[PDB]
Design an enzyme around this catalytic site. Structure first.
Site, PDB file in Angstrom:
ATOM      1  N   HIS A  35       1.403  -4.777   2.361  1.00  0.00           N
ATOM      2  CA  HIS A  35       2.168  -5.113   1.357  1.00  0.00           C
ATOM      3  C   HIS A  35       2.634  -3.617   1.089  1.00  0.00           C
ATOM      4  O   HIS A  35       2.052  -2.518   0.923  1.00  0.00           O
ATOM      5  CB  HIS A  35       1.741  -5.683   0.250  1.00  0.00           C
ATOM      6  CG  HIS A  35       1.108  -7.088   0.567  1.00  0.00           C
ATOM      7  ND1 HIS A  35      -0.264  -7.284   0.355  1.00  0.00           N
ATOM      8  CD2 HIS A  35       1.464  -8.171   1.013  1.00  0.00           C
ATOM      9  CE1 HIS A  35      -0.623  -8.476   0.898  1.00  0.00           C
ATOM     10  NE2 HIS A  35       0.282  -9.071   0.893  1.00  0.00           N
ATOM     11  N   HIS A  71       3.735  -2.086  -2.223  1.00  0.00           N
ATOM     12  CA  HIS A  71       3.533  -2.034  -3.613  1.00  0.00           C
ATOM     13  C   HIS A  71       4.562  -1.254  -4.621  1.00  0.00           C
ATOM     14  O   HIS A  71       5.144  -0.409  -3.813  1.00  0.00           O
ATOM     15  CB  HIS A  71       2.060  -1.810  -4.017  1.00  0.00           C
ATOM     16  CG  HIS A  71       1.247  -2.761  -3.491  1.00  0.00           C
ATOM     17  ND1 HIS A  71       0.411  -3.397  -4.470  1.00  0.00           N
ATOM     18  CD2 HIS A  71       0.734  -3.235  -2.296  1.00  0.00           C
ATOM     19  CE1 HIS A  71      -0.470  -4.309  -3.806  1.00  0.00           C
ATOM     20  NE2 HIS A  71      -0.226  -4.111  -2.471  1.00  0.00           N
ATOM     21  N   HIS A 108       3.053  -6.214  -6.004  1.00  0.00           N
ATOM     22  CA  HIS A 108       3.849  -6.084  -4.896  1.00  0.00           C
ATOM     23  C   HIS A 108       5.454  -5.785  -5.358  1.00  0.00           C
ATOM     24  O   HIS A 108       5.698  -6.240  -6.296  1.00  0.00           O
ATOM     25  CB  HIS A 108       3.877  -7.314  -4.032  1.00  0.00           C
ATOM     26  CG  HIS A 108       2.424  -7.755  -3.225  1.00  0.00           C
ATOM     27  ND1 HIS A 108       1.970  -8.912  -2.761  1.00  0.00           N
ATOM     28  CD2 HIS A 108       1.319  -6.906  -3.446  1.00  0.00           C
ATOM     29  CE1 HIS A 108       0.706  -8.920  -2.593  1.00  0.00           C
ATOM     30  NE2 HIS A 108       0.198  -7.753  -2.883  1.00  0.00           N
ATOM     31  N   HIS A 110       5.120 -14.987  -4.462  1.00  0.00           N
ATOM     32  CA  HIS A 110       4.532 -14.380  -3.245  1.00  0.00           C
ATOM     33  C   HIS A 110       4.666 -15.493  -2.256  1.00  0.00           C
ATOM     34  O   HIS A 110       4.661 -16.753  -1.963  1.00  0.00           O
ATOM     35  CB  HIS A 110       2.872 -14.193  -3.547  1.00  0.00           C
ATOM     36  CG  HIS A 110       2.334 -13.650  -2.168  1.00  0.00           C
ATOM     37  ND1 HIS A 110       2.582 -12.362  -1.695  1.00  0.00           N
ATOM     38  CD2 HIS A 110       1.561 -14.281  -1.478  1.00  0.00           C
ATOM     39  CE1 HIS A 110       2.165 -12.373  -0.552  1.00  0.00           C
ATOM     40  NE2 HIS A 110       1.099 -13.430  -0.377  1.00  0.00           N
ATOM     41  N   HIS A 169       7.897 -11.841  -2.186  1.00  0.00           N
ATOM     42  CA  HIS A 169       8.358 -10.404  -2.862  1.00  0.00           C
ATOM     43  C   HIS A 169       8.949  -9.539  -1.865  1.00  0.00           C
ATOM     44  O   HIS A 169       8.735  -9.842  -0.654  1.00  0.00           O
ATOM     45  CB  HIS A 169       6.861  -9.826  -3.192  1.00  0.00           C
ATOM     46  CG  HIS A 169       6.191 -10.815  -4.427  1.00  0.00           C
ATOM     47  ND1 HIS A 169       6.659 -11.150  -5.260  1.00  0.00           N
ATOM     48  CD2 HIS A 169       4.972 -11.043  -4.192  1.00  0.00           C
ATOM     49  CE1 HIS A 169       5.673 -12.043  -6.194  1.00  0.00           C
ATOM     50  NE2 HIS A 169       4.472 -11.843  -5.462  1.00  0.00           N
ATOM     51  N   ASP A 222       6.574  -8.418   0.627  1.00  0.00           N
ATOM     52  CA  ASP A 222       5.478  -9.109   1.405  1.00  0.00           C
ATOM     53  C   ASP A 222       5.962  -9.112   2.909  1.00  0.00           C
ATOM     54  O   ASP A 222       7.023  -9.599   3.442  1.00  0.00           O
ATOM     55  CB  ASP A 222       6.006 -10.566   1.194  1.00  0.00           C
ATOM     56  CG  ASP A 222       5.571 -11.144  -0.405  1.00  0.00           C
ATOM     57  OD1 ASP A 222       4.767 -10.179  -0.794  1.00  0.00           O
ATOM     58  OD2 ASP A 222       5.724 -12.116  -1.026  1.00  0.00           O
ATOM     59  N   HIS A 230      -4.878  -4.565   2.623  1.00  0.00           N
ATOM     60  CA  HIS A 230      -5.985  -5.354   1.886  1.00  0.00           C
ATOM     61  C   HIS A 230      -7.152  -5.823   2.380  1.00  0.00           C
ATOM     62  O   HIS A 230      -7.220  -5.794   3.611  1.00  0.00           O
ATOM     63  CB  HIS A 230      -5.310  -6.409   1.167  1.00  0.00           C
ATOM     64  CG  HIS A 230      -4.567  -5.880  -0.070  1.00  0.00           C
ATOM     65  ND1 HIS A 230      -4.959  -5.854  -1.374  1.00  0.00           N
ATOM     66  CD2 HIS A 230      -2.982  -6.006  -0.021  1.00  0.00           C
ATOM     67  CE1 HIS A 230      -3.678  -5.754  -2.213  1.00  0.00           C
ATOM     68  NE2 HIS A 230      -2.767  -5.566  -1.346  1.00  0.00           N
ATOM     69  N   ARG A 290      -7.927  -3.367  -2.579  1.00  0.00           N
ATOM     70  CA  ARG A 290      -7.126  -2.581  -1.783  1.00  0.00           C
ATOM     71  C   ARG A 290      -7.833  -1.334  -0.978  1.00  0.00           C
ATOM     72  O   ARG A 290      -8.322  -0.474  -1.731  1.00  0.00           O
ATOM     73  CB  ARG A 290      -6.156  -1.716  -2.966  1.00  0.00           C
ATOM     74  CG  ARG A 290      -5.507  -2.735  -3.851  1.00  0.00           C
ATOM     75  CD  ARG A 290      -4.715  -2.171  -4.932  1.00  0.00           C
ATOM     76  NE  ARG A 290      -3.954  -3.066  -5.662  1.00  0.00           N
ATOM     77  CZ  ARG A 290      -2.814  -3.109  -6.265  1.00  0.00           C
ATOM     78  NH1 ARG A 290      -2.289  -1.864  -6.063  1.00  0.00           N
ATOM     79  NH2 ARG A 290      -2.190  -3.911  -6.994  1.00  0.00           N
TER      80      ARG A 290
HETATM   81 ZN   LIG Z   1       4.102 -10.465  -2.666  1.00  0.00          ZN
END
Ligand SMILES: [Zn+2]
Ligand SMILES: [Zn+2]
Ligand SMILES: [Zn+2]
Ligand SMILES: [Zn+2]
Ligand SMILES: [Zn+2]
Ligand SMILES: [Zn+2]
Lengths: 153, 153, 153, 158, 153, 153
Positions: free
Chosen positions: E45, E47, E62, E70, E79, E82, E119, E142
């Site tokens: 993702h 962020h 995100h 999401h 997002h 995403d 992740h 993370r």
């Molecule tokens: Zn997301």
């Protein structure tokens, strides 16, 4: 590669600038920045005529080359200039970008030399159901308007 | 039978209304009523852009799709928007009607979404023998301007 | 506790609102929010007359009942209407709040019914070494102005 | 005086050594940028502190490139009109190896054409001799030695 | 023709490089090479913040400038950051090329100075149905992050 | 809108009250009313510490979160607590309203829990040139001070 702009003026603190960009024979991107608004949603429309000899009243009805009824920008039963609502924050400022395809800068239905109007009330999107919901949306009076003109780039 | 209109405004008392009416692809009739002008001839031109985000300054140069130099509406070597001078009476009113063939309301050279500008000074029709004669005339500052927009009939 | 307001308008995208607050015989607080400006500093002055019959031109010179030369708001050698510069960000928005004692809402020097003008250029504060520094501060042309009027509360 | 939208960025400075630190940047509207520096693990004494061009650390700090220099001028001191935009002078580390300093500059905006967001901070091995000191490298680098630690300038809340 | 890069570092063996290429105002081509990963799919993702003051946790949620829930890169309801899953082979290496249109390197929504996070666990896209699915994708912890920074060419 | 107050007390008859207002990320409006002053200008500063265990001496130097030198509110190589002068009338009363950008009530540089000091002498704004000109302004002794505390509404 084609660009237009409208300077929005009226009798009140509501004033603003609307820029239009269109590539190809594609969608038209509309960048809207208006201030002085009552916080909340306001009817925002492209009206038929670029005539301000009679204030904003002379811009006529919503631009409607398909003889269709008033709706939301998403639903296929709308006026070409039915661009829905713009929302003013707590400071009366509405800054938003809108993408639509019924408002080309070229072709038989070019909106060049036409007008933009920001309105008194919320556009009910043609579900009020008000008498006026199906023509105007109830957006109320015309707070400010401007004629759409050619601009470089 | 297509028709357009420009509302002319500026930084001074000078304001006016210009209506445009055009046959087929025939000549264009330009009906001018402007007030607040100093008595005398004033440069009256159709400028390139219907932009006024920076006042009349954003309307750019004289409309010139042939890339020629400035002269008089009767000249072979002219700008399309070179419509010469309009004359204000003792009351500061310039009311005149103009017919020209280089400012169509349709086609590759349409003037819809462009602008009109009334100028501070007399247009020397590029014979002035002035530095600016071949671009401007010595038409001077921009007293008032307006975006050319669509109107009914 | 008296209050006034001026809605600032012109031929460009430059628009704005000025609200004024003054208690009894205290200082006057001015909230200025203008948009559409060229990023950077702009001369912001209270001019003598609340007259727009000739655009912002008829608002006259800077309000100057003490017959002095042009200075900065901080200078004892200023006009009453010398409120300095307002700075526009990259989006052309300038918001500033100012306290001054020379622009009361009541008394023999009331600024009610006079005007505000925001200018083309930076105010050089009377320090720029220029012919116009001691009258205007250069600062240039008049982008938008409005008549100062009484308002509730 | 003027109302101000607060804009903010941060760079976390890391490298091969004990030298690490945090740098925060504050700029309201389009005015000057306030830079707060706290770095540790340094050799006591003055150290070159520069905003380098790229937020590229694929090759260690060396990939951050030269000093941010959008004018094209030669290396000078923050005081000098002969500057790189990223010419921020020296930070002096105390005996405990800590360098804490606050800096205000006008050539390092967080927005605009010359944004430093996504560019880098580098703290250097040696003293910045400024545009003086007379070394072959004085007008590029300031003979400021190697790159002890660096970080990419990134967005952070508020 | 703009290009960016993020170096991905964290507490474990997980590290990698992400280069971003964007021409025009369009899709961004993103090349991801990450190692040390558990074999299998891992959430990848973009962020919100390029903040690593408190490790990768400081990069925030995100990146989500449409204030939406999401989803998957394919869903329309996602997002902006995403970018789905990346799958590590048996050797712990994940190499992929991915193209998206919600992560420009310029504009009101430039992702420059923001971050990437790879992740702990698989991203159930949004539609797996769990507590965190419509915020995170229960992508887990993370593993490594890097601030997206500018790079030559 | 957050609000704060300082009740100012001291070694002499000099006492006063100061209120603070700040909306948004805007400027701080400071209302100052102090009595017992000798007629004339008196240095008025927001000092670093809200510590009065040792009278006003314990409030420290002027509040300076920038690394800067003493000056005047308009010129800004100044301290944040550099608020210039307040002038006492013949009756020893100084009433003034001040709007500034370096004294927010929130954020990392909040002046909440810090102090206001009214001083024996005129602030030379950084220009004596006097030994103290660049640190204090030769404002003299500390007549009265108060801690900036939060207050309702
Ligand atoms: Zn997301
Ligand atoms: Zn409609
Ligand atoms: Zn011409
Ligand atoms: Zn003046
Ligand atoms: Zn340098
Ligand atoms: Zn001070």
């Amino acid at each position: 590669k084609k660009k237009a702009v409208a300077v929005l003026k009226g009798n009140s603190a509501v004033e603003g600038v609307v820029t239009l960009t269109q590539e190809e024979d594609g969608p038209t991107t509309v960048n809207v920045r208006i201030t002085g608004l009552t916080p909340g949603p306001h009817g925002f429309h492209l009206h038929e005529f670029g005539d301000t000899t009679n204030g904003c009243i002379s811009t006529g009805p919503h631009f409607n080359p398909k003889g269709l009824t008033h709706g939301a920008p998403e639903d296929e039963i709308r006026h070409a200039g039915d661009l829905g609502n713009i929302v003013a924050n707590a400071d009366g400022v509405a800054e938003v970008t809108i993408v639509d395809n019924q408002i080309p800068l070229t072709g038989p239905n070019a909106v060049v030399g036409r007008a933009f109007v920001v309105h008194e009330l919320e556009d009910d999107l043609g579900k009020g159901g008000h008498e006026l919901s199906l023509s105007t949306g109830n957006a109320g009076g015309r707070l400010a308007c401007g004629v759409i003109g050619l601009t470089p780039t």
